[PDB]
A paper describes a structure:
As an example, MBK5214510 shows evidence for the presence of dimeric, tetrameric, hexameric, octameric and decameric species. In parallel to the crystallographic studies, we also determined the structure of MBK5214510 by cryo-EM and single particle analysis (**[Fig fig4]; [Fig figs6]; [Table tbls2]**). Within the 2D classes there were clear examples of top views of both octameric and decameric ring structures. Filtering of these two different classes allowed us to resolve the octameric and decameric structures at ∼4.2 Å and ∼4.8 Å resolution respectively (**[Fig fig4]; [Fig figs6]**). The octameric particles resembled the octameric ring we observed in the crystal structure, while the decameric particles were assembled in the same way as the octameric rings, but were composed of five identical homodimers rather than four. The decamer determined by cryo-EM is more divergent from the predicted decamer, with a significantly larger central pore, and is also wider than the cryo-EM structure of the human COMMD1-10 heterodecameric complex (**[Fig figs7]-[Fig figs8]**). (**B)** and **(C)** Cryo-EM structures of MBK5214510 octamers and decamers. These different oligomeric species are present in the same purified sample, indicating a degree of structural plasticity in the stoichiometry of the ring-shaped assemblies. In both cases a star shaped structure is observed with C-terminal COMM domains forming a central platform and the HN domains lying peripherally on each side. AlphaFold2 predictions were able to produce confident models of closed ring structures using either 8 or 10 monomers (predictions using more or fewer subunits produce either fragments of rings (e.g A0A558G9V7) or physically unreasonable structures) (**[Fig figs1]-[Fig figs3]**). The modelling, biophysical data (**[Fig fig3]; Fig. S4**) and cryo-EM data (**[Fig fig4]**) thus supports the idea that the bacterial COMMD-like proteins have a capacity to form closed ring structures with some plasticity as to the number of dimeric building blocks that are incorporated.
The ten eukaryotic COMMD proteins are core components of the Commander complex, with central roles in endosomal membrane trafficking and signalling. We find that while CCDC22, CCDC93, DENND10, VPS26C and VPS35L are restricted to the eukaryotic lineage, ancestral COMMD proteins are present in both Bacteria and Archaea. These prokaryotic COMMD-like proteins have very low sequence identity (<20%) to any eukaryotic COMMD family members but share a conserved and highly similar fold including both HN and COMM domains. Our biophysical studies, crystal and cryo-EM structures confirm COMMD-like proteins readily form homooligomeric rings composed of eight or ten subunits assembled from core dimeric building blocks and inter-dimer interactions that are analogous to the heterodecameric core structure of the eukaryotic Commander complex.
Residue numbers in the entry:
A (entry chain D), B (entry chain C), C (entry chain E), D (entry chain F), E (entry chain G), F (entry chain H), ...: 1 to 220
Write the structure that this text describes.
Amino acid sequence: MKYKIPKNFLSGFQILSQLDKKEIEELAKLLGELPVGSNVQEFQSAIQTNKELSENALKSADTIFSLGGLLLEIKADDSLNQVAEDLTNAYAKEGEEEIGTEQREQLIHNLLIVLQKAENLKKTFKAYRLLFENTRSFRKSRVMTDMRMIFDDDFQKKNQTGLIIHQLKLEYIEDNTSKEFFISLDNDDVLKLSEELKRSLEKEECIKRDFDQVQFINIK
Amino acid sequence: MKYKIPKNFLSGFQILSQLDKKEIEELAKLLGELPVGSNVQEFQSAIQTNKELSENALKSADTIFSLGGLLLEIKADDSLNQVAEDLTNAYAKEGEEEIGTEQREQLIHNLLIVLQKAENLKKTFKAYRLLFENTRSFRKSRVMTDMRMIFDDDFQKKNQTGLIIHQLKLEYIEDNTSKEFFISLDNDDVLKLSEELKRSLEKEECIKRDFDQVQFINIK
Amino acid sequence: MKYKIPKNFLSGFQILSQLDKKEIEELAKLLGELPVGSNVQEFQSAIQTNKELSENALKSADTIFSLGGLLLEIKADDSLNQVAEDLTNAYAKEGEEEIGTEQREQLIHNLLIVLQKAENLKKTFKAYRLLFENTRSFRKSRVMTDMRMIFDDDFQKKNQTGLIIHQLKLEYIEDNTSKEFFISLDNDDVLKLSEELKRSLEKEECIKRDFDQVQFINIK
Amino acid sequence: MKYKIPKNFLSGFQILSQLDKKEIEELAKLLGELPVGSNVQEFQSAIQTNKELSENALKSADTIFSLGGLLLEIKADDSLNQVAEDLTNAYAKEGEEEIGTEQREQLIHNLLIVLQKAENLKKTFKAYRLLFENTRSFRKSRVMTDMRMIFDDDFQKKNQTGLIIHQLKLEYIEDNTSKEFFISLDNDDVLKLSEELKRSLEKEECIKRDFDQVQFINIK
Amino acid sequence: MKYKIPKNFLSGFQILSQLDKKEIEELAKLLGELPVGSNVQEFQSAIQTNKELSENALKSADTIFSLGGLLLEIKADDSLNQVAEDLTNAYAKEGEEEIGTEQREQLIHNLLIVLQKAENLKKTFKAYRLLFENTRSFRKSRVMTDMRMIFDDDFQKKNQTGLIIHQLKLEYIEDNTSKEFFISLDNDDVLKLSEELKRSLEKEECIKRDFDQVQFINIK
Amino acid sequence: MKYKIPKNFLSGFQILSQLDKKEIEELAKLLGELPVGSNVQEFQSAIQTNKELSENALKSADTIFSLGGLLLEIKADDSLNQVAEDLTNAYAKEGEEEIGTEQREQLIHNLLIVLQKAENLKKTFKAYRLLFENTRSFRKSRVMTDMRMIFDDDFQKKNQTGLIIHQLKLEYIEDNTSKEFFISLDNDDVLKLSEELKRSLEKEECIKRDFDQVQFINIK
Amino acid sequence: MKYKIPKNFLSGFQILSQLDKKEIEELAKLLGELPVGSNVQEFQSAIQTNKELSENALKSADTIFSLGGLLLEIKADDSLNQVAEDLTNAYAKEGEEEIGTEQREQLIHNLLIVLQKAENLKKTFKAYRLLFENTRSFRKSRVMTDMRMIFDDDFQKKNQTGLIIHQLKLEYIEDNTSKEFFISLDNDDVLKLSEELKRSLEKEECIKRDFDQVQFINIK
Amino acid sequence: MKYKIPKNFLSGFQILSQLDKKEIEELAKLLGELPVGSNVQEFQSAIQTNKELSENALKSADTIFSLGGLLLEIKADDSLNQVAEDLTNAYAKEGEEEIGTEQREQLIHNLLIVLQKAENLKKTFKAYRLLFENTRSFRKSRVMTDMRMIFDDDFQKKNQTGLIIHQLKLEYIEDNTSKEFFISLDNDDVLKLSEELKRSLEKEECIKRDFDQVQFINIK
Amino acid sequence: MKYKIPKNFLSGFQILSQLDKKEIEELAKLLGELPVGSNVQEFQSAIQTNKELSENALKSADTIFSLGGLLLEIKADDSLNQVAEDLTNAYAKEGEEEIGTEQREQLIHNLLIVLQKAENLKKTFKAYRLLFENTRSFRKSRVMTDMRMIFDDDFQKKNQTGLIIHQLKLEYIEDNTSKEFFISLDNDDVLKLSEELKRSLEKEECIKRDFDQVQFINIK
């Protein structure tokens, strides 16, 4: 079929098919005003705080935000109108209802209205797509350090000496698989790494500064 | 045999067997004055700068420093005198010369003189031994970062946007085997890691401060 | 050929072939007086301290002691005379000399004289054979213990608490391959193990006591 | 959600949400009086023997003791108040009831009261956490020994001789997986190991003695 | 080339090329009188005891016996004359000498004389070939049995009871690879196996008896 | 719980709990008269042929015979009284009925009466336990032999010759897993193996004879 | 139990248990008249065409034919009467009905009547058993051939040349697993293989002819 | 370098460099008259039988025939003149002689003369190249068949029955690696395969017949 | 040592150590005039065509070009003077000569002169370094296509139909390992791929056009 439709989005598809023309047009306007990099939580909170929006939009907001992952899975080589028609067929086949012709056309028209524009969201999910062409990425880390004292073969001598060691442990996702990695350190190397990363941070700040003509974004 | 004698230390063993009584006693005194954690390079440089020492000591200094790795490979359960005798036999069997009885006894006596004392050096190599009961340890790392701009399907629109990414690569030894590991980062996580490691550094400083009654050393 | 002859035993075979009749007969007598479980070092030391024995016996003593490993590799189903003849052929083919007929017969006769009797030595090496039908056995072990103190998140509180841990490491041979194994313990389990092994030791002593009619040996 | 809530603790969560203010405050006091290293069985028995405590506390005692494993899974970087709120939400979502606002606030307040303090319990579970950063640990062992007699090829000779062997078998957990290991011994090595472990025990006693200023605990 | 010529048979090939016409004809006669199943040792001993045969035949007897393994490696589809010519070329190329034309023709003629006939030897090596189309075959075995007594937890009771066990170990060749296999038995199963193998032996004797019109051979 | 109670033994446990005092005492007497090595079938048949025994004993006879496998799974270090109490609790928790206090005490008392004594049965199952510390054991075997005739490339010659081969196939259990093994033989090796096993059988008979002071049993 | 009873044969077992004495005796006679190698389809068709036989026999004919696979799974070492009794017990335990004593005895008697004789069928399934002691066997094959023409780099030259190739593909069962194998051929090798297989066919015909005293069968 | 020059072709390259102009031109003519599919042996025999050709051509004939494998390893995209120059350089660098300029030019001119034309040979080696784009191909096979008789459990019955089986074994090269494959057959399947391959042979003959306008070749 | 010195560059190092001051200064000037992306062949050809340069420069030109791979293996964190000193030591230790002090200083000074500047070459090898942080890259490919005709089961019908197929094969290096990959295509997909790659080529041209302020290079 046209799309690998999740079975949970079917209610959102029904809401969008039955949604009012005013609501879809206003949502399209707001999406066209959406800045790049906005996340799902902020979008849904803004929808909630918008009084003119019924709960239908918020209940379908996740589906709307999910469009960015399929807005680029589709390509300019195809006609958005035919994409809307085929996806309406896919939803009527695998979704909640075999939509009647009038609501089928309403859903297709709403798809065309909303799937159009969608520029900043599509670019955001492209940045995310360009982001993870790689193999792996961090998620978190934890630092652990221990100290241990030095003893004698015969304890007729009191313990005067010890040793301090350091450990780091990190977490990351590789090829859609979560992972972690464990290492032990000494303070001097930690300081050296701090110097390296501080130098790279200054580089990054200078890069912020270099192209005042262009914007550079953090995407989460 | 008593020891897995390196074939390069044979000249050092010959020098020690023929070494003067004054030189061995003075070297034993200096070693008994050696602070814990002193490395081979510093010891050899100090030997060189000491005028009373002939080149024999410096040429055997590496062997002297190598004793710490076998000073603990031996154990208090054995008699140092018999250890010296057996190692003299091992050297006379696998080493340069089948030592004559007089020089055999001279070598054994010199071993007893110098292998005795050797407290701080033995404790240093114990710290190194207690150090690497683990599996792996760092050696170095390198930070790499890249930036990339965002484009349009049709370049009727000028490029206004881009994305900045960061990469770290690290090197380490595991189970006597050198290794490396590669990861990509974002600035926020780098800052968070900096905060973590700075907190741990403050912890380490407070640990420096906590036990004024005991010393804690960095060993290299 | 008859035996997988070591190339170092060839000198011992030559000595035995040329050895005096008095010496071989006396050695056969002494071997027939040998108690079970005697090791090579004790046998060679006794040979050295025996004045009537020339250095030929001591230089061939290791070969004599090596017979126990091949005294059972052979079996009663074969004639010791033909075994001696075939092994003389094997030595003359792979060994030092193509023995002349007179010394060939002398060697065969000496083999028959000495390979005969050899009761306690053969039984000792059978015990060793019955010993290692298994897979693995110990060789040594080492006990290691460490202690570590408990700290606070904020060191406004002084450290009042710590923890003590124990470690054991062991060495063993499996299937002719040396091995080791590492574990960490607590004092209570160490005490419990001490109780178990003490109970088993009392069992072993009672077993010493139970069969006064039979002897039980430790073989090394 | 906030926590990987076990589905059996839901009743304990309900009890805690509906629990009396006097009971939660008294339990918080008792927990603040709890010494480090106390185990679940002793805590529950003490709760049972305490007359002022209803069966609600004992039925939720296991959940209370389970907090130590999640008291450190959380970290000081987060606000305990928000932790309580989020975990109340998690319980109301995955647990028994969609708690009403009044009992929701009661549960959050009770969490704040009891999750606070909890110093010795948290330190105990930290010691357990610091305990098992390793790979494996014992659980038990069993000692087995056998004896076997020596025979002749022809039994015209009566059996006068035998051999005694010893076996040890041990059990341990590695990486959350139970394991065992099997070895055979001789009495001499058993005695040698006894000597080693006794020496280490004397070391441990001297370590007990060395730091009178600090306490060291056994945790089970 | 025609054959994977062993480099040790080259002397035998030279002897055969230079061998007398009378000797080759007599050897061909004797081989045509050879019964099936005769082994190399018996053939060589008979050659030695035959006075009319020079040492040339015995020194080439092993090569003659080796022909059976290549007498069937060749096939009736090829002309024995051309086989002799090609193998003479192979020997002159890889062997001792680039044979002169006269001795080349002599060798080819001798090959034709002797490689002809060779009926019983060829059939014997065919039986050996038909023998080892399988995967594996025995070579030897050894039987081992042990007995062990039953003890009490407290030896206030004297040992009245024991247990007897049996072991068998076997050796075999599989796919040109030597192998062994180990098992433990009880007396009853040994008796049952004895009964089975005795029944099969009676079957084999009846099979000896059944076809008086045909002969059946043991080949070694 | 105390025991991994089979769910089929629950009826036997109920019968034993409700069983008469006379019956349990008589069964304990009979078990104390039981010789070592008696199997379940013989015990149950004897119970059936005993007129004073009701069907309760036979229906619980299998459970009684199953005690030997758990009579040694328990150990002398534990109190049989507490073992009976804990197993009564285990049965009342996982078994047919939450036994009333009077029948609970009756069951515990019956367990103490019958679980006591049980000397020969416990020793029998110990022999079985000492039996299978190994890896594998036989269960059966089958002997197969075939004969095949020798033919010619051209059948102008009548077939005069053939070959006889032998095969053995065996079955065994390894590590609680059934197994089999297949081999082909020749008559001579079969005869040799017969000689070996007959020699070992004579050894076993001489071992029967050697210790008239002790008994040795076959256990099935 | 006695047999791994298929759950579909239970109806056949019921029919046989209730079958008339005349029918079972007549079927036993017919089976004793059955020639070796008869397949299930022919046997069932003959049963159908036999007017004296009710549909009971045909409905149980498959079970009757299935006996050959278990007629040899049993062995002469066991009593056919006890085999019938035990299999009647197995059917009454795992089959349709807990047979009443009268019909149980009827079934056992019918088994004894019919399981007896059964000579040619048993020998047929033995031939099938002797057949598949091997690893694999054919099931089918398919021949495929293709031809391709030769072209020029520049087609200013007309194509005058081509190449013809051949392919064979085959199917077989190995170790109860179906398999296939694919190869490409040339006409000359196909002709050579035809010659080989024709020669072997002539060999097989001569083998048909050689032993007029014995019969040789094709079994399917 | 230009070509992976074999070190044995160096003499052929020298001969070609020093070869006469008449000889190279005549050889080029003959090669231009060579039909497609001619093999090395036939070409060399024709060269030998040609009186006008010196032994130089035959000694370089193998190199000439080897050109087809490198005549297509080169491609029309390159200039044959520059190919000749570069290969002359390669031969002068890795070959016998650092050719003088005059003989260097002679060799290049001879290469251009002979490497030109070479149409049928190049097409032949292209057919061979187009041949082995696949993975594997036959080399030979062998057919083996056996027969075995059927016996009784008790030989009171004479053997009346037997079974005949068939075996095929084949050899092939895969990915430049020689291989073989073993299977057992029955006469019926052999006949069926004969029918299949005969049908395919008739297909191949009809394919011979179909395109009278084109030729199709067998290449060896 | 400082560098993993190739043993072939030793002559280049000697030449550079003995090289004239004028030559090294002129070469440094020329290198500072070198544009980015220049390859070794062009650099060496330019050196050859430069009359003022002796053959010393060309013979050391490859070493000079090899500096880019080690100019970045070193880093700005180190002093180029000390790098030159350490590499002079490395060459004097592992290279041709233990350089005399005067020529040692000359070599160090020449290294400082030439290793300095080197901007475009270093950036070129950085681009190559930034190039192959990936895993693999192409080297070549080859396109192959075939056509095949459609036939009938019975050739009473003439062949009117066929099928055309296409194949592509490609070569690439992965992780310093050469590789290839094989696929079959149809004309339509080839056309579609042509359209895709043409669109991407237009994109690349527009990218050429977009940043007139910056240069973008092809590096080989």
